[PDB]
RNA sequence: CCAAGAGAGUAGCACUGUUUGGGAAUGCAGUGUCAAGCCGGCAGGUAUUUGUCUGCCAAGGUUAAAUAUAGAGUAGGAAG
RNA sequence: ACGGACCAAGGAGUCAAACAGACGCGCAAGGGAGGAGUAUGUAUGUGAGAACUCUUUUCUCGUACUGAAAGGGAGAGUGUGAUUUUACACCCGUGGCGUGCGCAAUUUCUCUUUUUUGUGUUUUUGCCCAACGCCGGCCGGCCCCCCGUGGGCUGCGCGCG
RNA sequence: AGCGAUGCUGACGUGCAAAUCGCUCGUACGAUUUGGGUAUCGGAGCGAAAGACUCAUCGAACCACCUAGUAGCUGGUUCACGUCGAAGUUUCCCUCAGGAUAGCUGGUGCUUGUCUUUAAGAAGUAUUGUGCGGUAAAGCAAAUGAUUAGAGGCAUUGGUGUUCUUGUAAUAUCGACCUAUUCUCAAACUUUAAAUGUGCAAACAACCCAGCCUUAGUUAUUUUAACAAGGCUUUUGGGUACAUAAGAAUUGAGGCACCAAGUGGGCCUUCUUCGGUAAGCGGAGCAGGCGAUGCGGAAUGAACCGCUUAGGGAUAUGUGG
RNA sequence: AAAACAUAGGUUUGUGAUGCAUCCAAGUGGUGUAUGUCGCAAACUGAUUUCUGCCCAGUGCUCUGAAUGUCAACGUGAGAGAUUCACCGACGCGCGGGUAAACGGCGGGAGUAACUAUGACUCUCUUAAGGUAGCCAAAUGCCUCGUCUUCCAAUUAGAGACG
RNA sequence: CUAAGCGGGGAAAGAAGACCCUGUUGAGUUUGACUCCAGUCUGGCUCUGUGCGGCGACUUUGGAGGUGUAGUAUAGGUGGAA
RNA sequence: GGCUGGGGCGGCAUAUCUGUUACACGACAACGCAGGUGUCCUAAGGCGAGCUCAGUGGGAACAGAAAUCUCACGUGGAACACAAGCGUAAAUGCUUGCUUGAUUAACGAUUUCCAGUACGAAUCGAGACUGCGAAAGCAAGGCCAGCGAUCCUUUGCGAAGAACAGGAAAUAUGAACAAAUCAUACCAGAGGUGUCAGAAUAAUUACCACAGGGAUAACUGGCUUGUGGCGGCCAAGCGUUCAUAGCGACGUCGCUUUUUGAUCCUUCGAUGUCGGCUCUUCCUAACCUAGCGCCGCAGAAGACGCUAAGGGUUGGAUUGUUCACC
RNA sequence: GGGUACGACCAUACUUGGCCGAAUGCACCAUAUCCCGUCCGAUUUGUGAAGUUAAGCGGCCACAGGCCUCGUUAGUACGGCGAUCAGUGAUGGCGCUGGAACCCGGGGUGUUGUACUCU
RNA sequence: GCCCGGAUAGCUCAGUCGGUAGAGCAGGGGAUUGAAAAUCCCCGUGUCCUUGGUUCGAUUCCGAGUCCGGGCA
């Protein structure tokens, strides 16, 4: 059985990788928040505080909190027969807003905007096509296949 | 190690909350008492005609013991304890480190 | 014309042990030690001094009835 | 692998505290006596552990909790004024839910019935949630320190018996 | 004679026998036999000592008693049908044949309730949308780490040599070194990098519009600040709904809970994979079994094939012929 | 049933009675011992014979040894009191000394012949002391059927050597 | 279907393996185990007199009872002290 | 004690840290692989500023390869108290400068391991009070290992004030009351457990006891077949000539199981241990016998092979033997 | 469009070499009294004037280097799927699903905000 | 845990009824001894471990963490 640091390491994961070294950007810091955001978790390294244990990068949870430097994310962690919500104390630097949800809503409103426009706003306005289908065809030059060995002396392994 | 001896540090005391000068010192123990309640009791079991009735403990497993500093902020009638890491070496004498730019050899 | 006639090597204390739920001691037993102006003596569950205040008055002496019977009790019923 | 030649008769999950649930069962903030004791004939008996009880005194547990304590202690009603020490009033704390109740549309039905539709609304004791609020508790806050507008951590507590 | 017991591993070995018997034998005037009398006794004795022997009792004698003494263990452990139905696993232990605990289980529930599901809530799943790694793969001319040859230079005597003394000479010279080349390679190498997986998201408790309420939120200036932030908002206050035009399916309920068992040695397998030659070996990972089921198939089989089971009937298939 | 014990034979202690040894609940209890070192007690060794080395560091024992370390009560004097402390302070122990027919123990290191092998010879570390006398493949030797001599046709046997 | 045999098998019988392991199961025995104890010793105290005699303890007059250098000078030194 | 391919032993896989195993989430065993931990450090803490490495070249008395000096390069290849791993470069490094935040808390809130206990260890605020700085800011001792229940002891915790009647509305008790000790408290610390959730513990038993366990060794039997034991293949060489009469190196596959190991299936409420005697029968990888092939077989003799298990197959000595061996 | 400046993004923005540059400006560049700071005005501090675009800077260039980027490779490889099937054994095997890295080719070579300026 | 010798020179040890720094002895020269043997004279040298203390002056005189060696718990 194995050794256990709460920050017990790995091979090639935590290490800060391919030209991706160094501090978080100021863009990172310019960000802005509100709570309830569904944001995803990543690990810089940078400061080895506010830094989750292993579970958590690549997972999406929801923020419940914004503290000075940091934000609270409750995440559902799967134990036995359940997922428990865990509320984790990160400083802001280790988390980011997805698109996961964004689209859904985005579309939903956009669509509504259109659906609404379409009735009950002014205009009227084509989008898409159906799915997939049949068709007339006037092709104009079919081929076939003849494979391997003819002129194999030109090619193949030795 | 070595650490200070006197020390400007916080005293919250009622002769103020502030960072103040303290004398620093390192504890030793006010150990046990005859007539102490425990002792009275210990003694009670110990009485009579039996053999010996306790755990005597013989594991030792390290050697460290949390050093405690006893800090007396002057004004303050306040003494405080403040605990250190497990150590094999210690010292308070307010001397300082020096930086090594000269090896005699 | 006033008296005013109440238990000692015991009480106690140490010590030891044993013993107690009883705790810085519930007793007892041994051993040693060993009390009373009597403004006293005893008790008042944290050691003490110290003081009040509170309750009694030991250490000789006898005493139905209501209880027991518990395994092996004896005369004479009642039973399941 | 063990045990197991045969047949009768034996031959092994009991009584029982506090206690948790479940369920019936009683009554209900009381309930349970409870120990006892009385008590008068059916008539052996009798003035019935066991009959009937029957019960003043109550006893006992229960019908606020919190603090080691010292100790305090719940409509901090609601509402209200409120500069709410107070002082007033006196038939739901705040929100989320709610079988429900209401309304309209909805079918037929005379009307009824009223199918069906469409909604409304309503105490968080209907349940739970979610937030104060509340008792004891603790830090006493705010602030340089301390006090008041007011704090601000905490608990087997309290929130319409 | 006697007293004893050496050999036959004699006899017997359910014997005449709880130690017999035959022969055989030790010794047999002495530390010699024995009778009776007398004494030592259990954690004691005794003991020419074997821990002998001590009344078929003896590395603690025997009686009665405490006692039905104690058991993480052996064994047993006494009617029917129905209904539901496991675990070999979780943590800690002076803990490994055991608990506790959790989990699995049964039972008991409790609030609703899906046929309007484009506004039930759910789903061991897809879809999108939306997140995400360093296995497999690649690769070494990229680094890291490894490895083979030449070719092309520099040389600051690597070695060689001639012409030169000899040259920090020349010139040959072969090496070192340089360099680009070049082979072959990695579990704790690695750019890139899979597949296979892994998070999330997909509705009404929603969207907007107003205009509100409130804030010892933002070193403050509100204020017709901004933002923040939340609270609101009769008949939405007021508005506003699931089309695409294009992209699920399900959903023989969901919500929710009470509480007690029985279990903790497993074993078998496709797949991955470790140890070691190996092993029907050991040792893990996934799923499934078996276990704890039989039926049908594999002349034979716990786990292979097929398939699971009310009781039947009739039919046709399964695997297999 | 012997290679065992007993056993005479060997050797040492302990010990002279208000004792030693020793039994015991206790007592004016017991026994050795109705007795006294030609005595008793206690252990070891195991005819005769012959001899019995070295070590006392260790570990015991022993000591009349030392004397001022230590070592309990015990006392003793010291604060409102409790209460505290100090000094006092015993054998023992430290300590010092003895001791091996007490327990037991009793080395390792090099070199060295010009023929030869061989290494007497000589140097080393080191122990309490470093195993003497003796005696062996011996009930003792692991290597091991060690070796040789010897006996047998042929001998892991024997024996004799060797040791 | 057997008599007399017979001893391969019936993993015969034969005896809840004594070996072996385990067991928060034992003992007999051992020992510088842990932890006591019989025991042995020592001290302390005591029974406990009787003497005559030493040391202690008492505080009583304060006596024997106090010189560095340099102050030819008295040196713990204190103080009413001119 | 346990541990454990039996026990023992050894080892520590027992609390543990790391990296790796381990399937690109997550989780995963071995007495696997490769490593660590019991401390260290008043700065090696903390903060600023400054400064930049590992490394390479070129010069520069002494000085040469290696002193310094200096230019000049140079993505850290260093360096960062330490095992290991992470990170990382106008810094995190490194040097300097300054300091005490390694501080103090209502200390809630938070995470990890996880029983969704725990500790341990971490994370996030708020209050202090400091530090540092120009300032934002940072700063609660690099980050990750390096550490400890109940139980007990101990250390630390208001003086100061204002009382009428509590004057923050003034820290608790010690139960008949006083005043004073003494003692108890509340609370937060330290004091220790490495068998690391945390019992005060030596032998010996072949005199032995007991309960079980084939959940476990010690026989057979069972898998395997390393190990042994047997054959090829191959064929470098050998073998006067000579690859192959006969061989057979180097290789390199076979094959077997009268070896030996490994494994523990079974067996412990029983499967009678050695050897040997006897006695049978069987097997063939045929020693002898029948008969063939080759010969580096002239004869001679042997050798090699086939076909062949029908047949045959010893006495002693010594040695328990076995084996050994004359 | 450039410049300037603040950027943001953080390599098509990069090493390397040429060529060229109007403006505004940057820049180099002088100085060191003051302040300031340094062994040192190199840095920095303080002053800022003479020079000078040489450098920088800029822009471009470049069988440049690098990157960037696509294609190519290759449904191979490599996974997923199977009761099935061949296979000494790995394997290999089908059909059902997915899916490379390198290579070479090809092309590409900073983007663009804010404030300021400069006809 | 109390009891304590040792903390000084190479090793080992002191300071008028208030002054302050020791020998030994390794050592290092001499000298002695023809050179030796035997012997003599001279070298050197400490925080008086480690730190505190009375006072015009104080290792004199003093306090103490410590260190360290030993005895019973």
Q: What is the 3-state secondary structure (H, E, C) of chain A?
A: CCCCCCCCCCCCCCCCCCCCCCCCCHHHHHCCCCCCCEEEECCCCCCCCCCCCHHHCCCEEEEEEECCCEEEEEEEEEECCEEEEEEEEEEHHHEEECCCCHHHHHHHHHHHHHHHHHHHCCCCCCCCCCCCCCCCCCCCCCCCCCCCCCCHHHCCCC
A38-41, strands of its sheet edge to edge:
A82-91, A70-79, A60-66, A38-41, A95-97
Q: Residue B50, CA: closest nucleotide via C1'?
A: G36
User: Å between B74 CA and G77 C1'?
Assistant: 40
| Structure token digits, residue B21 | 């000068």
Residue with tokens 């002057």: B74
- Nearest-angstrom CA–CA distance, A50 and A70: 8
Residue with tokens 């100021």: A26
| Structure token digits, residue A157 | 């392994």
- How far is the CA of B103 from the CAs of B99, B100, in angstroms? 11, 7
Instruction: Evaluate the CA torsion angle A10, A13, A18, A23 in order and state its sign.
Output: negative
Rounded to the nearest 5 degrees, what angle is found at the Cα of B32, between the Cα atoms of B31 and B36? 155
Q: Are strands B6-11 and A60-66 parallel, antiparallel or unpaired?
A: unpaired
Residue with tokens 């640091």: A5
* Residue B76: CB atoms within 10 Å: 19
**Strand F contacts in B 22-41 (CB under 7 A):** 34-35
**Run of H or E including B39:** helix B37-46
- Nearest-angstrom CA–CA distance, B71 and B21: 10
Is the separation of the CB atoms in B5 and B71 below 8 Å? no
Rounded to the nearest 5 degrees, what angle is found at the Cα of A47, between the Cα atoms of A41 and A52? 35
A148 touches strand E (CB under 7 A): no
Does residue B24 sit in helix, strand or coil?
strand
Q: Which residues, 6+ apart, have CB-to-CB distance to A77 below 8 Å?
A: A55, A83, A84, A85, A86
* Residue A86: CB atoms within 10 Å: 16
A12 is in an annotated binding site: yes
Q: Which residues, 6+ apart, have CB-to-CB distance to A53 below 8 Å?
A: A6, A7
- Nearest-angstrom CA–CA distance, B81 and B88: 20
Residue A105 has phi, psi (to 5 degrees) of: -70, -35
- Nearest-angstrom CA–CA distance, B29 and B10: 24
- Nearest-angstrom CA–CA distance, A9 and B97: 35
The burial of A72, by beta-carbon neighbours within 10 Å (0-12 exposed, 13-18 middle, 19 or more buried), is given as: middle
- Sequence length of chain A is 158
- Nearest-angstrom CA–CA distance, A26 and A19: 17
- Nearest-angstrom CA–CA distance, B48 and B37: 19
- How far is the CA of B39 from the CAs of A16, A126, B46, in angstroms? 60, 94, 10
* Residue A38: CB atoms within 10 Å: 15
Question: How far is C-alpha B59 from the chain's CA centre?
Answer: 22
Rounded to the nearest 5 degrees, what angle is found at the Cα of A17, between the Cα atoms of A15 and A22? 90
Q: Residue A60, CA: closest nucleotide via C1'?
A: E200
Is the separation of the CB atoms in B20 and B7 below 8 Å? no
């Amino acid at each position: 059985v194995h050794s256990h640091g709460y920050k017990c390491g790995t091979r090639h994961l935590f290490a800060k990788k391919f030209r991706k070294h160094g501090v978080p950007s100021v863009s990172t810091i310019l960000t802005n928040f509100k709570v309830g955001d569904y944001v995803d978790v990543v690990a810089d390294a940078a400061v080895r505080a506010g830094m989750p244990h292993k579970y958590y990068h690549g997972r999406t949870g929801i923020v419940w909190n914004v503290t000075p430097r940091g934000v609270g994310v409750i995440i559902n962690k799967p134990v036995r027969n359940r997922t428990v919500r865990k509320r984790i104390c990160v400083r802001f630097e280790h988390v980011r807003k997805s698109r996961c949800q964004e689209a859904f809503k985005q579309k939903l409103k956009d669509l509504e905007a259109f659906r609404a426009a379409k009735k009950a706003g002014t205009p009227l306005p084509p989008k898409k096509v159906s799915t997939r289908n049949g068709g007339f065809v006037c092709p104009k030059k079919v081929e076939v296949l003849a494979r391997r060995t003819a002129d194999y002396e030109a090619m193949i392994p030795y | 190690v070595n650490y200070p001896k006197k020390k400007k540090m916080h005293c919250p005391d009622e002769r103020c909350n502030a960072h103040k000068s303290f004398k620093v010192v390192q504890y030793k123990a006010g150990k046990a008492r005859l007539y102490a309640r425990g002792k009275r009791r210990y003694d009670r079991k110990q009485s009579g005609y039996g053999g010996q009735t306790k755990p005597i403990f013989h594991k030792k497993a390290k050697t460290t013991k949390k050093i405690v500093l006893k800090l007396q902020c002057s004004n303050c009638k306040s003494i405080i304890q403040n605990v250190l890491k497990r150590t094999k070496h210690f010292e308070l004498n307010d001397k300082k480190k020096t930086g090594n730019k000269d090896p005699t050899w």
